[PDB]
Design a protein around this ligand. Structure first.
Ligand SMILES: CNC(=O)Nc1cccc(-c2ccnc(C)n2)c1
Ligand SMILES: [Cl-]
Ligand SMILES: [Cl-]
Length: 182
Protein backbone atom coordinates (compact mmCIF):
# COMPACT_ATOMS: atom_id res chain seq x y z
CA UNK A 1 0.00 0.00 0.00
CA UNK A 2 2.97 2.49 0.21
CA UNK A 3 6.00 1.53 -1.96
CA UNK A 4 7.09 3.18 -5.20
CA UNK A 5 9.65 2.05 -7.80
CA UNK A 6 13.40 1.58 -7.09
CA UNK A 7 15.71 3.72 -9.33
CA UNK A 8 19.15 5.33 -9.31
CA UNK A 9 19.07 9.21 -9.46
CA UNK A 10 22.88 9.50 -9.18
CA UNK A 11 25.89 7.14 -9.48
CA UNK A 12 25.84 4.79 -6.48
CA UNK A 13 22.57 6.22 -5.02
CA UNK A 14 19.32 4.13 -4.99
CA UNK A 15 15.91 5.45 -4.01
CA UNK A 16 12.22 4.62 -3.64
CA UNK A 17 9.13 6.34 -2.23
CA UNK A 18 7.58 5.00 0.99
CA UNK A 19 4.32 7.00 1.16
CA UNK A 20 5.33 10.72 1.28
CA UNK A 21 8.98 9.96 2.19
CA UNK A 22 11.87 9.50 -0.27
CA UNK A 23 14.05 6.65 1.08
CA UNK A 24 17.64 6.54 -0.25
CA UNK A 25 20.75 4.35 0.25
CA UNK A 26 24.43 4.97 -0.77
CA UNK A 27 27.92 3.95 0.36
CA UNK A 28 30.38 6.56 1.73
CA UNK A 29 31.50 8.64 4.72
CA UNK A 30 28.46 9.78 6.79
CA UNK A 31 30.52 12.58 8.49
CA UNK A 32 30.59 14.45 5.12
CA UNK A 33 26.74 14.53 4.80
CA UNK A 34 24.40 17.48 5.37
CA UNK A 35 20.93 16.79 6.96
CA UNK A 36 18.77 18.21 9.74
CA UNK A 37 19.66 15.11 11.85
CA UNK A 38 22.64 12.71 11.61
CA UNK A 39 22.31 9.46 13.62
CA UNK A 40 25.27 7.90 15.56
CA UNK A 41 25.27 4.11 16.38
CA UNK A 42 27.03 3.96 19.77
CA UNK A 43 27.21 2.00 23.05
CA UNK A 44 24.92 2.22 26.11
CA UNK A 45 27.50 4.68 27.64
CA UNK A 46 27.37 7.03 24.63
CA UNK A 47 31.22 7.04 24.32
CA UNK A 48 32.08 4.35 21.75
CA UNK A 49 34.88 5.50 19.47
CA UNK A 50 35.15 2.52 17.12
CA UNK A 51 33.78 2.15 13.57
CA UNK A 52 31.43 4.91 12.40
CA UNK A 53 31.18 6.30 16.02
CA UNK A 54 34.92 7.06 16.02
CA UNK A 55 34.49 9.22 12.91
CA UNK A 56 31.31 10.90 14.22
CA UNK A 57 32.78 11.85 17.67
CA UNK A 58 36.12 12.98 16.17
CA UNK A 59 34.48 15.17 13.50
CA UNK A 60 31.72 16.52 15.85
CA UNK A 61 34.33 17.61 18.44
CA UNK A 62 34.93 17.69 22.18
CA UNK A 63 31.89 19.86 23.09
CA UNK A 64 29.60 17.06 21.69
CA UNK A 65 31.61 14.38 23.59
CA UNK A 66 31.07 16.45 26.74
CA UNK A 67 27.30 16.80 26.00
CA UNK A 68 27.11 12.97 25.71
CA UNK A 69 28.85 12.19 29.03
CA UNK A 70 26.90 14.96 30.83
CA UNK A 71 23.55 13.48 29.75
CA UNK A 72 24.64 9.82 30.35
CA UNK A 73 25.26 10.51 34.07
CA UNK A 74 21.87 12.32 34.59
CA UNK A 75 19.43 9.44 33.85
CA UNK A 76 19.13 6.04 32.13
CA UNK A 77 18.72 6.98 28.41
CA UNK A 78 17.62 4.72 25.49
CA UNK A 79 19.08 7.46 23.16
CA UNK A 80 20.37 11.03 23.52
CA UNK A 81 20.02 14.24 21.44
CA UNK A 82 23.04 16.65 21.22
CA UNK A 83 24.15 19.54 19.10
CA UNK A 84 25.85 18.89 15.73
CA UNK A 85 29.23 20.33 16.70
CA UNK A 86 31.32 20.51 13.53
CA UNK A 87 29.09 18.10 11.58
CA UNK A 88 26.73 19.62 8.96
CA UNK A 89 23.52 19.05 10.89
CA UNK A 90 21.23 20.74 13.45
CA UNK A 91 21.32 17.80 15.92
CA UNK A 92 22.96 14.37 16.35
CA UNK A 93 20.73 11.58 17.72
CA UNK A 94 22.94 8.92 19.40
CA UNK A 95 21.18 5.50 19.45
CA UNK A 96 22.46 2.26 21.07
CA UNK A 97 23.72 -0.15 18.36
CA UNK A 98 22.69 -3.27 20.34
CA UNK A 99 19.07 -2.13 20.88
CA UNK A 100 16.09 -3.16 18.72
CA UNK A 101 16.74 -1.27 15.45
CA UNK A 102 13.05 -0.78 14.52
CA UNK A 103 12.46 0.87 17.97
CA UNK A 104 15.54 3.12 17.54
CA UNK A 105 14.50 4.33 14.05
CA UNK A 106 10.88 4.92 15.24
CA UNK A 107 12.28 7.15 18.02
CA UNK A 108 14.47 9.12 15.56
CA UNK A 109 11.44 9.74 13.25
CA UNK A 110 9.26 10.95 16.16
CA UNK A 111 11.96 13.32 17.48
CA UNK A 112 12.43 14.80 13.96
CA UNK A 113 8.65 15.52 13.66
CA UNK A 114 8.76 17.24 17.10
CA UNK A 115 11.42 19.65 15.70
CA UNK A 116 9.67 20.09 12.26
CA UNK A 117 12.77 18.63 10.53
CA UNK A 118 12.68 17.43 6.90
CA UNK A 119 15.89 15.34 6.38
CA UNK A 120 17.62 12.47 8.24
CA UNK A 121 20.88 10.60 7.51
CA UNK A 122 21.71 7.35 9.38
CA UNK A 123 24.31 4.54 9.20
CA UNK A 124 23.47 0.79 9.03
CA UNK A 125 22.70 0.93 12.80
CA UNK A 126 23.97 -2.10 14.77
CA UNK A 127 26.16 -3.63 12.01
CA UNK A 128 29.48 -2.40 13.53
CA UNK A 129 30.54 -3.09 17.17
CA UNK A 130 27.06 -4.52 18.03
CA UNK A 131 27.44 -7.23 15.32
CA UNK A 132 23.74 -7.40 14.34
CA UNK A 133 23.21 -9.12 10.97
CA UNK A 134 22.92 -6.71 7.94
CA UNK A 135 19.75 -8.35 6.51
CA UNK A 136 17.90 -8.07 9.84
CA UNK A 137 19.06 -4.41 10.21
CA UNK A 138 17.84 -3.46 6.66
CA UNK A 139 14.45 -5.15 7.27
CA UNK A 140 14.06 -3.25 10.61
CA UNK A 141 14.99 0.21 9.27
CA UNK A 142 12.55 -0.04 6.33
CA UNK A 143 9.78 -1.56 8.56
CA UNK A 144 10.08 1.45 10.95
CA UNK A 145 9.57 3.91 8.07
CA UNK A 146 6.57 1.89 6.71
CA UNK A 147 4.90 1.87 10.17
CA UNK A 148 5.47 5.65 10.63
CA UNK A 149 3.81 6.34 7.23
CA UNK A 150 0.93 3.85 7.85
CA UNK A 151 0.06 5.65 11.13
CA UNK A 152 -0.17 9.03 9.31
CA UNK A 153 2.77 10.41 11.34
CA UNK A 154 4.92 11.76 8.45
CA UNK A 155 4.25 15.52 8.07
CA UNK A 156 7.58 17.41 8.21
CA UNK A 157 9.89 14.42 7.42
CA UNK A 158 10.45 14.14 3.64
CA UNK A 159 13.84 12.39 3.12
CA UNK A 160 15.55 9.49 4.96
CA UNK A 161 19.02 8.47 3.66
CA UNK A 162 21.18 5.52 4.86
CA UNK A 163 24.93 6.19 4.18
CA UNK A 164 26.70 2.85 4.59
CA UNK A 165 30.45 2.37 5.25
CA UNK A 166 30.88 -1.05 3.50
CA UNK A 167 29.73 -1.57 -0.13
CA UNK A 168 28.82 -5.19 0.70
CA UNK A 169 26.23 -3.93 3.25
CA UNK A 170 24.76 -1.52 0.63
CA UNK A 171 24.09 -4.58 -1.59
CA UNK A 172 21.92 -6.13 1.19
CA UNK A 173 19.86 -2.90 1.55
CA UNK A 174 19.27 -2.69 -2.26
CA UNK A 175 18.00 -6.33 -2.32
CA UNK A 176 15.55 -5.54 0.52
CA UNK A 177 14.22 -2.48 -1.41
CA UNK A 178 13.67 -4.66 -4.54
CA UNK A 179 11.74 -7.24 -2.44
CA UNK A 180 9.30 -4.48 -1.38
CA UNK A 181 8.95 -2.51 -4.61
CA UNK A 182 5.53 -1.67 -6.04
C1 LIG B 1 27.34 1.27 12.24
N1 LIG B 1 28.29 0.62 11.36
C2 LIG B 1 29.62 0.63 11.54
O1 LIG B 1 30.17 1.16 12.52
N2 LIG B 1 30.34 0.01 10.53
C3 LIG B 1 31.74 0.10 10.33
C4 LIG B 1 32.51 -1.04 10.13
C5 LIG B 1 33.87 -0.92 9.94
C6 LIG B 1 34.47 0.33 9.91
C7 LIG B 1 33.72 1.49 10.11
C8 LIG B 1 34.36 2.84 10.10
C9 LIG B 1 33.69 3.98 9.65
C10 LIG B 1 34.37 5.18 9.72
N3 LIG B 1 35.63 5.26 10.17
C11 LIG B 1 36.21 4.13 10.60
C12 LIG B 1 37.60 4.23 11.13
N4 LIG B 1 35.61 2.93 10.58
C13 LIG B 1 32.35 1.35 10.31
CL1 LIG C 1 27.04 -0.63 15.94
CL1 LIG D 1 27.39 1.72 8.31
Amino acid sequence: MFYGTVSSPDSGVYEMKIGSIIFQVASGDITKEEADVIVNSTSNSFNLKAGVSKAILECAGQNVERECSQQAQQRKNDYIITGGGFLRCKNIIHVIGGNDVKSSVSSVLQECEKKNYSSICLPAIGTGNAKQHPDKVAEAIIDAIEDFVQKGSAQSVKKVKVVIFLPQVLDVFYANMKKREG
